[PDB]
């Protein structure tokens, strides 16, 4: 979830309730760092992944 707030023009998480909890974790990881555009402007798909 992302919202366009009038007071600050940025996109914050609204409800990160994807899951309830975790009983146990066999494995956890963080992938190499990289960056994102985070723009809501309308248009054709400028990139393919």
């Amino acid at each position: 979830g992302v919202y366009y707030h009038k007071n600050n023009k940025s996109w914050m998480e609204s409800e990160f309730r994807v899951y309830s909890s975790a009983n146990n974790c066999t494995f956890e990881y963080v992938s190499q760092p990289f960056l994102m555009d985070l723009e809501g402007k309308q248009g054709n798909f400028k990139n393919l992944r």
């Binding site: 146990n24 974790c25 066999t26 494995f27």
Partner: protein, 49 residues
Amino acid sequence: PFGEVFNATRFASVYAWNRKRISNCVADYSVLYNSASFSTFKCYGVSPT
């Protein structure tokens, strides 16, 4: 992170022991007896060395 488990302030009781998880990391044996001088170190089915 054996050191944090090994060097801890308090440990649980025998009836309510603490179960933990070691996953996707690397252990060692040479960091067990260099001035550790514990009561008893032994292993079953394989030499601790």
